Coordinates of all heavy atoms in Angstrom, one line a residue:
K143 N -3.3 15.3 0.9 CA -1.9 15.0 0.7 C -1.0 16.3 0.6 O 0.0 16.3 1.3 CB -1.7 14.3 -0.6 CG -0.3 13.9 -1.0 CD -0.2 13.2 -2.3 CE 1.2 12.8 -2.6 NZ 1.4 12.1 -3.9
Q144 N -1.4 17.2 -0.2 CA -0.7 18.5 -0.3 C -0.6 19.3 1.0 O 0.5 19.8 1.3 CB -1.3 19.4 -1.4 CG -0.6 20.7 -1.6 CD -1.5 21.8 -2.2 OE1 -2.0 21.6 -3.3 NE2 -1.6 22.9 -1.5
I145 N -1.7 19.3 1.8 CA -1.7 20.0 3.1 C -0.6 19.4 4.0 O 0.1 20.2 4.6 CB -3.1 19.9 3.7 CG1 -4.1 20.6 2.9 CG2 -3.0 20.4 5.1 CD1 -5.6 20.3 3.3
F146 N -0.6 18.1 4.1 CA 0.4 17.5 5.0 C 1.8 17.6 4.3 O 2.8 17.7 5.0 CB 0.1 16.0 5.2 CG -1.1 15.8 6.0 CD1 -1.9 14.7 5.7 CD2 -1.4 16.6 7.1 CE1 -3.0 14.5 6.5 CE2 -2.5 16.4 7.8 CZ -3.3 15.3 7.5
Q147 N 1.9 17.6 3.0 CA 3.1 17.7 2.3 C 3.7 19.1 2.5 O 4.9 19.3 2.7 CB 2.9 17.4 0.9 CG 4.2 17.3 0.1 CD 4.0 16.5 -1.2 OE1 3.0 16.8 -2.0 NE2 4.9 15.5 -1.5
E148 N 2.8 20.1 2.4 CA 3.3 21.5 2.6 C 3.3 22.1 4.0 O 3.4 23.3 4.2 CB 2.4 22.4 1.7 CG 2.5 22.1 0.2 CD 1.9 23.1 -0.7 OE1 0.8 23.6 -0.4 OE2 2.5 23.3 -1.8
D149 N 3.3 21.2 5.0 CA 3.4 21.6 6.4 C 3.5 20.3 7.3 O 2.5 20.0 8.0 CB 2.3 22.5 6.8 CG 2.6 23.3 8.0 OD1 3.7 23.0 8.6 OD2 1.8 24.2 8.4
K150 N 4.6 19.6 7.2 CA 4.8 18.4 8.0 C 4.4 18.6 9.4 O 3.9 17.6 10.0 CB 6.3 18.0 7.8 CG 7.3 19.1 7.9 CD 8.6 18.6 8.5 CE 9.2 17.3 7.9 NZ 9.3 17.4 6.5
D151 N 4.7 19.7 10.0 CA 4.4 19.9 11.4 C 2.9 19.6 11.8 O 2.6 19.4 12.9 CB 4.8 21.4 11.8 CG 6.3 21.6 11.7 OD1 7.1 20.9 12.3 OD2 6.6 22.6 11.0
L152 N 2.1 19.6 10.8 CA 0.7 19.3 11.0 C 0.4 17.8 11.3 O -0.6 17.5 12.0 CB -0.2 19.7 9.7 CG -0.5 21.1 9.5 CD1 -1.3 21.2 8.2 CD2 -1.4 21.7 10.7
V153 N 1.3 17.0 10.9 CA 1.2 15.5 11.1 C 1.1 15.1 12.6 O 0.2 14.4 13.0 CB 2.3 14.8 10.4 CG1 2.1 13.3 10.6 CG2 2.2 15.1 8.9
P154 N 2.2 15.5 13.4 CA 2.1 15.0 14.8 C 0.8 15.6 15.5 O 0.3 14.9 16.4 CB 3.4 15.5 15.4 CG 3.8 16.6 14.5 CD 3.4 16.1 13.1
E155 N 0.3 16.7 15.0 CA -0.9 17.3 15.6 C -2.1 16.6 15.1 O -3.1 16.4 15.9 CB -0.9 18.8 15.2 CG -0.4 19.7 16.3 CD -1.3 19.7 17.5 OE1 -2.5 19.7 17.4 OE2 -0.7 19.8 18.6
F156 N -2.1 16.2 13.8 CA -3.2 15.5 13.2 C -3.4 14.2 14.0 O -4.5 13.8 14.4 CB -3.0 15.3 11.8 CG -4.2 14.7 11.0 CD1 -5.3 15.6 10.8 CD2 -4.2 13.5 10.5 CE1 -6.4 15.1 10.1 CE2 -5.3 13.0 9.8 CZ -6.4 13.8 9.6
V157 N -2.3 13.5 14.2 CA -2.3 12.2 14.8 C -2.8 12.3 16.3 O -3.7 11.6 16.7 CB -0.9 11.6 14.9 CG1 -0.9 10.4 15.8 CG2 -0.4 11.3 13.5
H158 N -2.2 13.2 17.0 CA -2.6 13.5 18.4 C -4.1 14.0 18.6 O -4.6 14.0 19.7 CB -1.6 14.4 19.1 CG -1.8 14.5 20.6 ND1 -2.6 15.4 21.2 CD2 -1.1 13.8 21.5 CE1 -2.5 15.2 22.5 NE2 -1.6 14.2 22.8
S159 N -4.7 14.4 17.5 CA -6.1 14.9 17.6 C -7.1 13.9 17.0 O -8.1 14.3 16.5 CB -6.2 16.2 16.8 OG -5.4 17.3 17.3
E160 N -6.7 12.6 17.1 CA -7.6 11.6 16.6 C -7.9 11.7 15.1 O -9.0 11.4 14.6 CB -8.9 11.5 17.4 CG -8.7 11.4 18.9 CD -9.6 10.3 19.5 OE1 -10.8 10.3 19.2 OE2 -9.2 9.5 20.4
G161 N -6.8 12.2 14.3 CA -7.0 12.3 12.9 C -7.2 11.1 12.1 O -8.0 11.0 11.2
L162 N -6.5 10.0 12.5 CA -6.6 8.8 11.8 C -8.0 8.2 11.8 O -8.6 7.7 10.9 CB -5.6 7.7 12.3 CG -4.2 8.2 12.2 CD1 -3.3 7.1 12.8 CD2 -3.8 8.3 10.7
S163 N -8.6 8.3 13.0 CA -10.0 7.9 13.2 C -10.9 8.5 12.2 O -11.7 7.9 11.5 CB -10.4 8.1 14.6 OG -9.7 7.3 15.5
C164 N -10.7 9.9 12.1 CA -11.5 10.6 11.2 C -11.4 10.1 9.8 O -12.4 9.8 9.1 CB -11.0 12.1 11.2 SG -11.9 13.1 10.0
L165 N -10.1 9.8 9.4 CA -9.9 9.3 8.0 C -10.6 8.0 7.9 O -11.3 7.8 6.9 CB -8.4 9.1 7.8 CG -7.5 10.4 7.8 CD1 -6.1 10.0 7.4 CD2 -8.1 11.3 6.7
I166 N -10.5 7.1 8.8 CA -11.2 5.8 8.7 C -12.7 6.0 8.7 O -13.4 5.4 7.9 CB -10.9 4.9 9.9 CG1 -9.4 4.7 10.1 CG2 -11.6 3.6 9.7 CD1 -8.8 3.9 8.9
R167 N -13.2 6.9 9.6 CA -14.7 7.1 9.7 C -15.2 7.7 8.4 O -16.3 7.3 7.9 CB -15.0 8.0 10.9 CG -14.9 7.3 12.2 CD -14.7 8.3 13.4 NE -14.5 7.5 14.6 CZ -14.1 8.1 15.8 NH1 -13.8 9.4 15.8 NH2 -14.0 7.3 16.8
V168 N -14.5 8.7 7.8 CA -14.9 9.3 6.6 C -14.7 8.4 5.4 O -15.3 8.6 4.3 CB -14.2 10.6 6.4 CG1 -14.7 11.3 5.1 CG2 -14.5 11.6 7.6
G169 N -13.8 7.4 5.5 CA -13.5 6.6 4.3 C -14.1 5.2 4.2 O -14.2 4.6 3.1
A170 N -14.4 4.6 5.4 CA -14.9 3.2 5.4 C -16.1 3.0 4.4 O -16.1 1.9 3.8 CB -15.4 2.9 6.8
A171 N -17.0 3.9 4.3 CA -18.1 3.7 3.4 C -18.1 4.7 2.2 O -19.2 5.2 1.8 CB -19.4 3.7 4.1
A172 N -16.9 5.1 1.7 CA -16.9 6.1 0.7 C -16.5 5.5 -0.7 O -16.1 4.4 -0.8 CB -15.9 7.2 1.1
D173 N -16.7 6.3 -1.7 CA -16.4 5.9 -3.1 C -14.9 5.6 -3.2 O -14.1 6.2 -2.6 CB -16.8 7.0 -4.0 CG -18.3 6.9 -4.4 OD1 -19.1 6.9 -3.4 OD2 -18.7 6.9 -5.6
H174 N -14.6 4.7 -4.1 CA -13.2 4.3 -4.4 C -12.3 5.5 -4.5 O -11.2 5.5 -4.0 CB -13.2 3.4 -5.6 CG -13.9 2.1 -5.5 ND1 -14.2 1.3 -6.5 CD2 -14.4 1.5 -4.4 CE1 -14.8 0.2 -6.1 NE2 -14.9 0.3 -4.8
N175 N -12.8 6.6 -5.2 CA -12.0 7.8 -5.4 C -11.6 8.4 -4.0 O -10.5 8.9 -3.8 CB -12.7 8.7 -6.3 CG -12.7 8.3 -7.7 OD1 -11.8 7.6 -8.2 ND2 -13.8 8.6 -8.4
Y176 N -12.6 8.5 -3.2 CA -12.4 9.1 -1.8 C -11.4 8.3 -1.0 O -10.5 8.8 -0.5 CB -13.7 9.2 -1.1 CG -14.8 10.1 -1.6 CD1 -14.6 10.7 -2.9 CD2 -16.0 10.4 -0.9 CE1 -15.6 11.6 -3.4 CE2 -16.9 11.2 -1.5 CZ -16.8 11.8 -2.7 OH -17.7 12.6 -3.2

């Protein structure tokens, strides 16, 4: 959160680099806190 908050320009790059998939892949079977 802080990383994207402290550098918005990272967002369009994160998106274009298949970032959302990563989030889903790393979170689908993770602890509620993650």
Side-chain angles (χ1 to χ4, degrees):
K143 180 179 183 185
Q144 181 200 302
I145 295 170
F146 291 143
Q147 189 160 48
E148 299 191 321
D149 202 352
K150 43 149 48 57
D151 298 305
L152 281 179
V153 181
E155 261 294 318
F156 189 67
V157 173
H158 193 272
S159 296
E160 303 225 315
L162 298 178
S163 291
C164 175
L165 294 184
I166 303 296
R167 285 156 185 172
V168 179
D173 278 54
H174 295 167
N175 291 323
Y176 292 8

